Curated annotation (Swiss-Prot), chain A:
UniProt miscellaneous comment: The wild-type allele (erythromycin sensitive) is dominant over the resistant allele, and is also dominant over the temperature-sensitive allele at both low and high temperatures.
Species for this entry: Escherichia coli (strain K12)
Protein name from the UniProt record: Large ribosomal subunit protein uL22
GO CC annotations, alphabetized: cytoplasm; cytosol; cytosolic large ribosomal subunit; large ribosomal subunit
Lineage, broadest ranks: Bacteria, Pseudomonadati, Pseudomonadota, Gammaproteobacteria, Enterobacterales
GO biological process: assembly of large subunit precursor of preribosome; cytoplasmic translation; cytosolic ribosome assembly; response to antibiotic; ribosome assembly; translation
Keywords: Antibiotic resistance, Ribonucleoprotein, Ribosomal protein, RNA-binding, rRNA-binding
Domain of life: Bacteria
Record-linked Pfam families: Ribosomal_L22
One Gene Ontology molecular-function label: structural constituent of ribosome
Subunit note: Part of the 50S ribosomal subunit. In TnaC-stalled ribosomes forms part of the binding pocket for L-Trp with the leader peptide and uL4.
Function: This protein binds specifically to 23S rRNA; its binding is stimulated by other ribosomal proteins, e.g. uL4, bL17, and bL20. It is important during the early stages of 50S assembly. It makes multiple contacts with different domains of the 23S rRNA in the assembled 50S subunit and ribosome.
List of residues binding L-tryptophan: 90
Family affiliation: Belongs to the universal ribosomal protein uL22 family.
Swiss-Prot record, chain C:
Top-level taxonomic group: Bacteria
PANTHER family cross-referenced by the UniProt entry: 50S RIBOSOMAL PROTEIN L4, LARGE RIBOSOMAL SUBUNIT PROTEIN UL4M
Example of a GO biological process term: cytoplasmic translation
Region described as Disordered: 44-71
Function per UniProt: One of the primary rRNA binding proteins, this protein initially binds near the 5'-end of the 23S rRNA. It is important during the early stages of 50S assembly. It makes multiple contacts with different domains of the 23S rRNA in the assembled 50S subunit and ribosome. Protein uL4 is a both a transcriptional repressor and a translational repressor protein; these two functions are independent of each other. It regulates transcription of the S10 operon (to which uL4 belongs) by causing premature termination of transcription within the S10 leader; termination absolutely requires the NusA protein. uL4 controls the translation of the S10 operon by binding to its mRNA. The regions of uL4 that control regulation (residues 131-210) are different from those required for ribosome assembly (residues 89-103).
Listed Pfam families: Ribosomal_L4
Keywords attached to this entry: Antibiotic resistance, Repressor, Ribonucleoprotein, Ribosomal protein, RNA-binding, rRNA-binding, Transcription, Transcription regulation, Transcription termination, Translation regulation
SUPFAM superfamilies in alphabetical order: Ribosomal protein L4
Keyword check for Transcription regulation: yes
Family: Belongs to the universal ribosomal protein uL4 family.
Name of the protein described by the UniProt record: Large ribosomal subunit protein uL4
Keyword Transcription: yes
UniProtKB/Swiss-Prot annotation, chain D:
Entry's family note: Belongs to the bacterial ribosomal protein bL21 family.
Protein known as: Large ribosomal subunit protein bL21
Function noted in UniProt: This protein binds to 23S rRNA in the presence of protein L20.
Keywords of this entry: Ribonucleoprotein, Ribosomal protein, RNA-binding, rRNA-binding
UniProtKB/Swiss-Prot annotation, chain E:
A molecular function (GO) term: mRNA regulatory element binding translation repressor activity
Cell membrane keyword on record: no
Function according to Swiss-Prot or TrEMBL: One of the primary rRNA binding proteins, it binds close to the 5'-end of the 23S rRNA. It is important during the early stages of 50S assembly.
Keyword list, A-Z: Ribonucleoprotein, Ribosomal protein, RNA-binding, rRNA-binding
One Gene Ontology term from the biological process aspect of the record: cytoplasmic translation
One Pfam family per UniProt: Ribosomal_L20
Keyword Lyase: no
Subunit structure comment from the entry: Part of the 50S ribosomal subunit. Contacts L21.
NCBIfam families named among the record's database cross-references: rplT_bact (TIGR01032)
HAMAP family on file: Ribosomal_bL20
Upper lineage: Bacteria, Pseudomonadati, Pseudomonadota, Gammaproteobacteria, Enterobacterales
Protein name per UniProt: Large ribosomal subunit protein bL20
Length: 110, 48, 201, 103, 117
RNA sequence: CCCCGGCGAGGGGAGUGAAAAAGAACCUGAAACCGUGUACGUACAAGCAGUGGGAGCACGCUUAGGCGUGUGACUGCGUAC
């Protein structure tokens, strides 16, 4: 029984979050939560809140138990980018992209 | 004799040239104007 | 030649040159095409680079900027620019020689009698301007899609046919090439065919 | 036992019961075609190499089916010379089944 | 009568990109590069339908040469012997016999040696 | 309405609806571009990256059919528009 949680429009680039996502791909949720606790990354805090929210969905909506859950699927897709203007020297302007990402965690006992 | 059965005479409605519509048409990329010079230009050509 | 009436069962003599000539498809096609062109309204226009609202200011200088050279924001290459060959209100009506027009009607009329699509009656009228009567009358004659041509345009017959979709009445002088072809049957009174012969010499 | 015959400007090494694809023969489907032009017949260490064709050697076959081969695309292209043309092609063939190899 | 080009343009761009399946990088993704790759592929295919007939004949000749020298004669004298013996087996078949039927190939060498001697 | 969360954002249920993969960043939702999964290839190998030949593997078959599909070791030729 798969269970999904998502964080859409997370204020972080997908390239930075993917560094944390591949740390927990395939691990048991108990072991994954410890990995995210001691990963000195801002994305580790974002992924942890999505992971534990997927755990809550699995136990409250699907009645699953925490002891058997595993991170079967996790991926980070690119979200919409916010365009910003940054002035540079000699009157030139640059367009700054504040990238976002969609974080998706899928836990399952099977 | 219906509106969707009348046909023009054979050879009375020749199709016009369409310049610059690809290689297969035979008139692409120059419209039969050669390469350069006054006569190849838009509005080019000498008076009578 | 004789045109047998449908009800009186009497023949009606007509000119062989008008109702018995060959079918000139090339001639009829040109007249039919020209008639459709005459119906075109041709009311349309776009804006050239001269009519597009905007300024004649050069968007950026000729050299140095590193961009493709531009001379006007109205250029047809640009978004919101003008149309290169913007249309104007034009007239699509063609010229048809008088003899080519009349020559096409004869070829159409002679083709109708060859297809038995021309029905000749001595008279055709209804008492009151009520479409129910006319619809009943055509059902008696086994007619649904028919062009009715009369000598004198009666108002009752005109009003009774106004709401019938596949039916229309017409004066003897009001016939046109595409109407004679568009309808499955053509019903002409004995007076109308007489007036048509004088029209077509 | 196998034999070598020539058909359609090419030669084939076939054996009994084998299906071989040849060029288009003007023979209806299901008919029997004879190849009296046999170049060689080998039968268990007993080989018959023939001057022109093996004397008496005949191969009987059954026209299985006609058809057209896979479509090949012909692309001609001259760079910088404003010239290119394309053309498809499907070659007609005739499948025959070797019914008998007569020495 | 304005004509929007969107539907037919996408159709012919897909037709090119479909023929470019399996090409590396942009050659299977972007139309400008895929179109050149497809044209070049057609040129090579036309050229190689002629080269295929040369490469296979070159392969048959090499195999015949090997099998002939196993019987004590070179490819040159072997081919000349067969023509003097009026044998008209082509090189595709000779190379086929040389691999799958040694004894029949030896019989051909004997026939060729006889026409020379 | 319930659950996770910061009395957040966001999400999972429930419910509405013909449809919620119509949820307001809302008809359809192409392409570039970016990912996850699977099959195959790839760490002694030199170049317009394909093409001709071609093993092996995977898979669909049919079924002893010996075909199809994906991949492509190795090899001939090959300097984009
Ligand atoms: Mg010139
Ligand atoms: Mg030029
Ligand atoms: Mg010059
Ligand atoms: Mg303006
Ligand atoms: Mg405009
Ligand atoms: Mg006039
Ligand atoms: Mg040659
Ligand atoms: Mg909420
Ligand atoms: Mg949508
Ligand atoms: Mg290696
Ligand atoms: Mg090379």
């Amino acid at each position: 029984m798969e269970t999904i949680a998502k964080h859409r429009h997370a204020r972080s680039s997908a390239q930075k979050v993917r560094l944390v996502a591949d740390l927990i791909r395939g691990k048991k949720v108990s072991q994954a939560l410890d990995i995210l606790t001691y990963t000195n990354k801002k994305a580790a805090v974002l992924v942890k809140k999505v992971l534990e929210s997927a755990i809550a969905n699995a136990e409250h909506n699907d009645g699953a138990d925490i002891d058997d859950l595993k991170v079967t699927k996790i991926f980070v897709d690119e979200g919409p980018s916010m365009k910003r203007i940054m002035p540079r020297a000699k009157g030139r302007a640059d367009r700054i992209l504040k990238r976002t990402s969609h974080i998706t965690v899928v836990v399952s006992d099977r | 004799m219906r509106l969707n059965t009348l046909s023009p005479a054979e050879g009375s409605k020749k199709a016009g040239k369409r310049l610059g519509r690809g290689i297969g048409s035979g008139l692409g990329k120059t419209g039969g104007r050669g390469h350069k010079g006054q006569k190849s230009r838009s509005g080019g050509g000498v008076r009578r | 030649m004789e045109l047998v009436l449908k009800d009186a069962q009497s023949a009606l003599t007509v000119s062989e040159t008008t109702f018995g000539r060959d079918f000139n498809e090339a001639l009829v096609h040109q007249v039919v095409v020209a008639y459709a062109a005459g119906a075109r309204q041709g009311t349309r226009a776009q804006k050239t680079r001269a009519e597009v609202t905007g300024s004649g200011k050069k968007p950026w200088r000729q050299k140095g900027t590193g961009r493709a050279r531009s001379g006007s924001i109205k250029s047809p290459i640009w978004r919101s620019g003008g149309v290169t060959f913007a249309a104007r209100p034009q007239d699509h009506s063609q010229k048809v020689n008088k003899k080519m027009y009349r020559g096409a009607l004869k070829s159409i009329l002679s083709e109708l009698v060859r297809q038995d699509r021309l029905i000749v009656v001595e008279k055709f009228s209804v008492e009151a301007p009520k479409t129910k009567l006319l619809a009943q009358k055509l059902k008696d004659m086994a007619l649904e899609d028919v062009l009715i041509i009369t000598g004198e345009l009666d108002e009752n017959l005109f009003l009774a046919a106004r709401n019938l979709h596949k039916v229309d009445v017409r004066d003897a002088t009001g016939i046109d090439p595409v109407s004679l072809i568009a309808f499955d049957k053509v019903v002409m009174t004995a007076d109308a065919v007489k007036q048509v012969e004088e029209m077509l010499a | 036992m196998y034999a070598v015959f020539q058909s359609g400007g090419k030669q084939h090494r076939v054996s009994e019961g084998q299906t071989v694809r040849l060029e288009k023969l003007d023979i209806a489907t299901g008919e029997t075609v004879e190849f009296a032009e046999v170049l060689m017949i080998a039968n268990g260490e007993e080989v018959k190499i023939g001057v022109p064709f093996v004397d008496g050697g005949v191969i009987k076959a059954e026209v299985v089916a006609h058809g057209r081969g896979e479509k090949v695309k012909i692309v001609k292209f001259r760079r910088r010379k404003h010239y290119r043309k394309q053309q498809g092609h499907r070659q007609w063939f005739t499948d025959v089944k070797i019914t008998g190899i007569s020495a | 009568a304005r004509v929007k080009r969107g539907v037919i343009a996408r159709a012919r761009h897909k037709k090119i990109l479909k023929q470019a399946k399996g090409y590396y990088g942009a050659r299977s993704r972007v139309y400008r590069v895929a179109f050149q790759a497809v044209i070049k592929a057609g040129q090579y295919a036309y050229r190689d339908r002629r080269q295929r007939k040369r490469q296979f004949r070159q392969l048959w000749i090499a195999r015949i040469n090997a099998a002939a020298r196993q019987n004590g004669i070179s490819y040159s004298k072997f081919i000349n012997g067969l023509k003097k013996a009026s044998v008209e087996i082509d090189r595709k078949i000779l190379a086929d016999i040389a691999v799958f039927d040694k004894v029949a190939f030896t019989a051909l060498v004997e026939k060729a040696k006889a026409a020379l001697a």
